[PDB]
Design a protein around this ligand. Structure first.
Ligand SMILES: CCCCCCCCCCCCCCCC(=O)O
Lengths: 429, 429
């Protein structure tokens, strides 16, 4: 029994950590800074992510560690289990320090700089139209089902299709809320709450639908290329330039590039070029474009690109549970989440996910890719939160080697959905 | 010359980063959070640390990249070059988020957990008395030189001996200021300015005397030791446990252990056991004791200890320049620092460092260690700034394999000096 590992820690060591956390909670002593925040969040995320990953049905279909972690943390906040000091520490970690934007910037730059430049240019000609086709199909089916259920098309486009089809909470929920407030000038709280609820429902349906799509792909040998996206000789003409040995300095350079690209995007979106026309472009979209331009330019060495990828891997696979504890504490309210679990809303989300899958599959077939793997890669992983949950959709499916495609889908889809969301916000209100 | 590397980045890449920083500064747009803080501080630390390393005489003797960096950052703050937004972002990173405490916690846990358990338990029987002998010799020499210069014994002990023989800025300067305020009930800042100035002067003199000690060791062979500390058959019989494979999960476990140990120390020092006797113990000394006890207990696996060491290496070798930029911006004030350089202070610091060297050498010879190696490891690398002066001294000498001894000396001696400072503060007032 003692050989069981919790977050890579032997059971006695995690017992020591939990004793420390309980002592701090009961003595009401905690440094309201990043150290106290990490001390609480690492332990809580470890235990609850392990529980969520072990529980069978939750792990298989619901979403597992991140969903369980943030739901339980938000329930802890609601029930008053958390002390005001711990709540303040977590809110200082992810509000004053903005560790959320740090994490999102690291993930964006890792996902974009990871790919080889020639492969990126080869993809962007045919892969991007598949993303656009998935978006338009999801929008069409969302409008149809909204008309069926009587929800107005304006409300559908504002609340249902865009938050679902865009990125996760860190990118694609709070940026859309900010753009909504900046353009339409209504309160952010209710928009954010409903968007988060329907986004979580869409994540649930995305995992389940990827599972059933893997089943149907097993059933039908044709229209499914196991573990391969392209249908043209599986990209027979493919060469890798080179990659060397990666040291700690390369990872640090990746972090520096993360932060510098985010700063440049912030400056450009805030003061340099706030608006191309009547549309306002968000600094996350500018960051995606800037990192893509940096990758295409060739300034980055292969070692630097590998270091950025490895830093992104470290963040995504270690600090994700910490991020989820903080998200559960700061950006979730159980009462309104539950009040947004109506049968109408859940069926709307299911139909939108069907639309995204169908559009992505038909676009991939039209542009030369395998339709099922296209449907998981784009459409799915875009309806899914992205980052956390892109791994879950790939894990539910038998296909995991497409993780680079999944991350690039999440990031570029985020940029595009923010651009289109700004356009539609201006067009309607 | 475009292949020349600045902080591991080629010249065009750093040109892009510096263009980003200049655009941010001139447009006065910057996110006042950890992302903006790192965006400023990586760039500034990189350029100015490279300048400091390339500067020949400064690099070799006066100080390294850390010294050059925080001096330049302090000058930038003094001359008004830094924008108010940039100052706010850096102070948010260093004070509101309290990145300094996280850095110190990671350093302490790496330096103590990284040591093999059996080797640590065998070494402490003869290495701690060397540290104590060095401290007592430094105190005696400081008292003598203060009597020569007319400085009172209590003033000498409070302002020159303890701040020099303690750790660096993070541990041994601000903890000493806090203890001074809590015990004697006097102003923190007036103590801290003189403490940091004397600490910097002592660091310079310690590096110079380390070079002199290397020369004298080359001269006389029977004191040298040729880079080996122990003088008992050169470790004829020794066994080490295999470490296995190191992963990102072990690195994250090291981070968890660092943060949890810091939290436990904070709780113990604030609520559980604020005072073991009449003396009050600081939470940094408590953390040193807790991490030593955790190492002795054997709960941590060798993989986990290697991961803690790897985090210590990553932080110490990459985020040190960022931390130095933050220290220069926030905790450094050139006006009173320069006012604190004088003939009397310089002579007192030099005599204190010489006394520490003599005491450590005598203790090492009595306990069996090589005299020159013992005087470098304890006394030196303890009078320094705990995190950077040890690297600078070991680089000034030809010995670098004693980095583990230097690290454990810095951290454990910092804890011991904190306890001793509390005792003497209570004694005098
Ligand atoms: C807000 C605080 C940010 C702290 C960022 C810490 C980043 C640590 C990066 C470590 C990963 C790279 C080195 C791994 C080494 C190994 O796995 O052996």
């Amino acid at each position: 029994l003692l050989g069981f590992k919790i977050f890579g820690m032997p059971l006695p060591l995690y017992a020591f950590a939990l004793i420390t956390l309980l002592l701090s909670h009961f003595y009401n002593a905690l440094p309201t800074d990043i150290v106290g925040g990490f001390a609480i969040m690492f332990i809580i995320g470890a235990i609850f992510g392990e529980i969520g990953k072990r529980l069978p049905i939750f792990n298989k279909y619901i979403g597992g560690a991140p969903v369980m972690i943030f739901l339980v943390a938000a329930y802890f906040v609601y029930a008053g289990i958390f002390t005001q000091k711990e709540i303040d520490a977590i809110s200082n970690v992810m509000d004053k320090s903005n560790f959320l934007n740090l994490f999102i910037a690291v993930l964006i730059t890792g996902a974009i700089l990871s790919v080889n430049r020639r492969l990126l240019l080869k993809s962007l000609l045919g892969y991007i139209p598949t993303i656009l086709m998935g978006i338009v199909g999801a929008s069409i089916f969302g409008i149809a089902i909204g008309l069926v259920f009587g929800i107005p098309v304006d409300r559908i486009m504002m609340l249902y299709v865009l938050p679902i089809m865009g990125g996760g909470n860190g990118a694609g929920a709070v940026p859309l809320s900010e753009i909504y407030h900046s353009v339409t000038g209504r309160s952010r709280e209710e928009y954010y709450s409903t968007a988060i609820a329907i986004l979580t429902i869409a994540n649930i349906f995305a995992i389940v639908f990827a599972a059933v799509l893997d089943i149907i792909g097993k059933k039908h040998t044709w229209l499914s290329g196991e573990g391969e996206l392209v249908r043209k000789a599986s990209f027979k003409v493919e060469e890798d330039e080179k990659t060397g040995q990666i040291t700690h300095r390369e990872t640090a350079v990746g972090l520096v590039l993360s932060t510098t690209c985010f700063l440049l995007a912030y400056v450009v979106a805030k003061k340099i070029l706030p608006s191309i026309g009547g549309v306002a472009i968000h600094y996350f979209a500018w960051m995606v474009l800037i990192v893509a331009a940096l990758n295409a330019s060739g300034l980055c060495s292969p070692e630097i690109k590998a270091g950025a990828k490895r830093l992104s891997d470290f963040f995504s696979k270690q600090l994700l549970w910490v991020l989820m504890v903080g998200v559960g504490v700061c950006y979730t309210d159980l009462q309104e989440i539950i009040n947004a679990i109506t049968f109408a809303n859940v069926v709307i989300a299911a139909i939108i996910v069907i639309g995204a899958v169908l559009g992505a599959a038909i676009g991939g077939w039209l542009m030369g890719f395998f339709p099922i793997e296209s449907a998981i890669t784009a459409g799915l992983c875009m309806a899914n939160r992205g980052g956390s949950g892109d791994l879950e959709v790939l894990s539910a499916c038998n296909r995991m080697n497409l993780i680079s495609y999944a991350q690039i889908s999440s990031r570029l889809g985020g940029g595009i959905v923010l651009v289109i969301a700004s356009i539609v916000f201006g067009m309607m209100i």
